[PDB]
Amino acid sequence: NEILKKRLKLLKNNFGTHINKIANKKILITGANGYIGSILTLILHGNAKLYCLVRNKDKMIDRFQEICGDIDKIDIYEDLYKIQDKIDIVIHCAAPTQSDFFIENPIDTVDIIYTNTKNILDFSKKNNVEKIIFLSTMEIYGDVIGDNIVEDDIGKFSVTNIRNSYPLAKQISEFMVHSYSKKYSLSTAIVRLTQAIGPTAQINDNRVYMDFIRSAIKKSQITLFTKGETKREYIDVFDVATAIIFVMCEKKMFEIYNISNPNIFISIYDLAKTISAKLNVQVVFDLSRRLNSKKIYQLGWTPLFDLNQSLDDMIKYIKE
Amino acid sequence: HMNEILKKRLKLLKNNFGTHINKIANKKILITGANGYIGSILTLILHGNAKLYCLVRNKDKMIDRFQEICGDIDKIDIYEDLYKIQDKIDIVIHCAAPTQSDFFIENPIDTVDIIYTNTKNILDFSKKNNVEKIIFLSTMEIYGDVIGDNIVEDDIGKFSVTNIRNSYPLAKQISEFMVHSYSKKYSLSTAIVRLTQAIGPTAQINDNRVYMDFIRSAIKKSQITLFTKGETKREYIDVFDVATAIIFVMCEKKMFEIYNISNPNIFISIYDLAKTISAKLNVQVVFDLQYLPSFSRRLNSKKIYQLGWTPLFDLNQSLDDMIKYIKEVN
Ligand SMILES: NC(=O)c1ccc[n+]([C@@H]2O[C@H](COP(=O)([O-])OP(=O)(O)OC[C@H]3O[C@@H](n4cnc5c(N)ncnc54)[C@H](OP(=O)(O)O)[C@@H]3O)[C@@H](O)[C@H]2O)c1
Ligand SMILES: NC(=O)c1ccc[n+]([C@@H]2O[C@H](COP(=O)([O-])OP(=O)(O)OC[C@H]3O[C@@H](n4cnc5c(N)ncnc54)[C@H](OP(=O)(O)O)[C@@H]3O)[C@@H](O)[C@H]2O)c1
Ligand SMILES: Nc1ccn([C@@H]2O[C@H](COP(=O)(O)OP(=O)(O)O)[C@@H](O)[C@H]2O)c(=O)n1
Ligand SMILES: Nc1ccn([C@@H]2O[C@H](COP(=O)(O)OP(=O)(O)O)[C@@H](O)[C@H]2O)c(=O)n1
Ligand SMILES: [Cl-]
Ligand SMILES: [Cl-]
Asked: Which CATH number fits domain B2-201+236-265+296-318: 3.10.180.10, 2.30.30.240, 3.60.20.10, 3.40.50.720?
């Protein structure tokens, strides 16, 4: 409770004037039971009227109660076509996010993401939504290398590499989003996220940082199967949520934003080291690319959570 | 008239390639978008030899098209409903797509949705009815930013999500991905053929692709107008040569393969195409300045050559036959 409360209070202090340009907007969040979707719901519910599209209502209640949210101030739907009230802003978070799924089920990866993007843009256009935010991925930059990748950079994709299911589905989605904006004057923004971290992540999450946390707790040891020199950007999930909120507030027909914390670029080894020290174990061995996130800074956004707080909060949160 | 042209063409095909055409007699062949330029020519060449199934949006349109091109309607079965086809189909050739530039940019969303959904549907139909092989007609627009000559099937292009004109290539790219993925997960044999631009007889006067823009302007306006400087160079290929290349690929037994299909002997600037057409119709070419970015590109077509295919028709024959066919109709 206290971890989340301290975070809700810090956000409001730094940016409450912004969260305010959002008072009583009707906000639809798809994939709202998900990591990012649920943190957005938490932050915005009450101060606005929150509609949550999810595959399973009960799963939504359980997640929302766990992270200390008032279910009586969210309207949970399972069927887009039952939402009858007017909607001001849509945040589309719904997607399959398991890497395994991308290679095991590349057909459905494409079909699911394509179909949902289509359905939500159709819904948005028909409903004369004020703005739709589409959550995308740094995987859209594909091959591109550099320490300063801008939104106008563009990956290439082999059609015969099945792991491209997810980036190719997000690319076609992005194209549809821009298209609805140019054709119909529907306000849209795309946000390309690095990789979210911080409290409310679960022990079973298939991400390297959580593999390290799990392995330190269960095996009292973290094993690296390479030298771990690859560097990766991370950003606290609350700082993702606040960035999306800033984008929501910008009146602009079309825009693309990289969302990352440019202070966090860490090697896998260094990540393993700090996690191990935090859990009183050791790293043992058994034998890149950075986005420019300057654009988002121009809205007045800043990230509040550094890697160390994000890890402490995430670990402490799991333990309790 | 028309029929002399067509008969001569079919006889040449038989003389050169009757061997390969024969590897397919009595196969059950489903052609989607069969009323279109390439689909209908494939049907023309193949009906009689083999059992032809033609999926179209409108049966009478397909009847009328097939008779315009001197086909025998009693030797093909036309369907408007995929689900109403019962017989075990051996080979599917997927030809249905929107092809007009204007539609790509006025309707980018519908461009993507139509191509994606039709690809998905025909792949599910194929998988479900244990089809031997499916051939997917793709485009040299797949190569995106790739420039210059000798472009091989493994070369990969980049695409901007903010260029509305990418509706067609992004839709083909995601479809290619789908097609590869079905061959990798279900052991369905798939082929992708990346085509340049077909020309030749039985092109219709309302087509808005550039060759017909020129011909139709020549005839109606007594003048051809370019809207660009026309320095873009492209590859062209006679529609009957496209169809024979597709037939050679049909005969391959290969789990997955991508082929460039072009005539390496035909590479021409838009301008020079305009002037040569204007020579044939006794008009002038003019400009009104004030489309794709103005690249230049040639495909490596060695794989299809390797199967034993050659193109039979030169640019003058293709254009002459195309123009004469159009004069005879209207
Ligand atoms: N986490 C990141 O750093 C990150 C990075 C780049 C992009 N993104 C994108 O941002 C969005 C949110 O990510 P996240 O981290 O919150 O992901 P998450 O925790 O995996 O949750 C994703 C949400 O989508 C739903 N979903 C999953 N499969 C679905 C399907 N087949 N049909 C419909 N809904 C489905 C999930 O509902 P169920 O529980 O019912 O499956 C859940 O509500 C996604 O679009 C994701 O691709 C996230
Ligand atoms: N011609 C070329 O140089 C060339 C080059 C590259 C790629 N290709 C590909 O080759 C294939 C055949 O091209 P083509 O030149 O024969 O094209 P076409 O003459 O324009 O014929 C298109 C075919 O697709 C059908 N079609 C169009 N819109 C449709 C829709 N919304 N739903 C269902 N069917 C639809 C048309 O039927 P309707 O009468 O019902 O509209 C017709 O049967 C296409 O996939 C095309 O992208 C052609
Ligand atoms: N136990 C581990 C896990 C990851 N790694 C390194 O960390 C990188 C990122 O790990 P990951 O599991 O998130 O993703 P992949 O990029 O390996 O699919 C790996 O490519 C390895 O170089 C390691 O060295 N030892
Ligand atoms: N009337 C015309 C038609 C085409 N064009 C040029 O010819 C090219 C090919 O025409 P198109 O409409 O088939 O081609 P895309 O640009 O859609 O590939 C265009 O890109 C323009 O450069 C022209 O200058 N004037
Ligand atoms: Cl519902
Ligand atoms: Cl559209």
From this structure: 3.40.50.720
